[PDB]
């Protein structure tokens, strides 16, 4: 029967476009979770109750180690709430901020895990994530990746089936999307180039605060390759950021599999990635469940029919 009275509210872990995320404790079980809390009002106001249903449904039907589990969805009169498994090692944005750059081996580990989950989404849920960014990437207690946020997913995409909605994050949009062409799943692979490029290089491949200029870069210019990149790495990023989806790594019929075979991932054993038998190159050092050292402090520190019923929103897990 779940409501807000069933949890204690301990820490604000993050805030923004996505509503507010709070480290909560379930009263009846003592268990910790991240509760993402939206106001029903902003969601109608931005004509996007469809995103929330999409996210609800994508979370209920996914079980995968590198996607954050849902334990409850419940709504109130004024809010929608997604109680999800808590990722205790923090935001990867946090971590790459402190370190500037990841090692090849470390970027390889995370990227392996992202490919795993995205290959899952594509080939088992027929879902195209669409919004892969550093900011949507958490770490659990053992240092494994967790992808969160499914509002911008496309559902029911099979083979090369295509889509037209103009969405994502400006800095990550793939060329064929800027081009106002119909696009398919190879978007997700473009997004993965930008995240790998960020991890290994220390900056986005295309940057301007002016979008018109930012979009012209994405369309017009080749990536720069820092001289610290090994030849395998120059090759994976070059292939993942082919501007033509048809020429992109992961963009033929074999999808993720063209990326798993790439020499950058040589001697990564994919079933081992999946089964979590590879050592995370960084074990978060947390001192308890309530310890939020790896969450960013602007947040840790803080502490009608515009309000409709969302039908069959409410959910409680039981595999």
């Amino acid at each position: 029967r779940v409501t807000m009275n069933e949890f204690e509210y301990l820490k604000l872990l993050g805030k923004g476009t996505f509503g507010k995320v709070i480290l909560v404790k379930e009263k009846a079980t003592g268990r910790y979770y991240a509760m993402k809390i939206l106001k029903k009002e902003v969601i109608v106001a931005k004509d996007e109750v469809a995103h929330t249903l999409t996210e609800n449904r994508v979370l209920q039907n996914s079980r995968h180690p590198f996607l954050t589990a849902l334990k409850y969805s419940f709504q109130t009169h004024d809010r929608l709430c997604f109680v999800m498994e808590y990722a205790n090692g923090g935001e990867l944005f946090f971590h790459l901020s402190r370190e500037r750059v990841f090692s090849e081996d470390r970027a390889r580990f995370y990227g392996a895990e992202i490919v795993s989950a995205l290959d899952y989404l594509h080939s088992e849920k027929n879902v195209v994530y669409r919004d892969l960014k550093l900011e949507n990437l958490m770490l659990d207690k053992d240092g494994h990746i967790k992808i969160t946020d499914f509002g911008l997913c496309k559902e029911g995409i099979k083979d090369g089936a295509t889509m037209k909605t103009f969405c994502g994050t400006p800095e990550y949009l793939a060329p064929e999307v800027l081009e106002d062409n119909d696009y398919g799943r190879a978007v997700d692979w473009w997004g993965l180039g930008v995240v790998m490029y960020e991890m290994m290089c220390g900056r986005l491949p295309f940057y301007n605060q002016d979008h018109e200029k930012l979009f012209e870069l994405i369309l017009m210019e080749e990536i720069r390759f820092p001289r610290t990149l090994g030849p395998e790495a120059k090759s994976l990023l070059s292939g993942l950021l082919k501007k033509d989806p048809k020429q992109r790594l992961g963009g033929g019929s074999e999808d993720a599999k063209e990326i798993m075979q790439h020499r950058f991932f040589a001697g990564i054993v994919w079933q081992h990635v999946y089964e979590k038998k590879l050592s995370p190159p960084f074990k978060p050092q947390v001192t308890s469940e309530t310890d939020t050292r790896y969450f960013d402090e602007e947040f840790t520190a803080q502490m009608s029919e515009r309000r409709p019923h969302f039908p069959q929103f409410d959910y409680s897990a039981s595999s």
């Binding site: 476009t17 944005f93 901020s97 960014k133 909605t165 969405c167 994050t169 400006p170 986005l204």
Partner: peptide
């Protein structure tokens, strides 16, 4: 220190 980006949907 890189600023956070923002997702959007037209």
């Amino acid at each position: 220190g890189r600023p956070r980006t923002t997702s959007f949907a037209e």
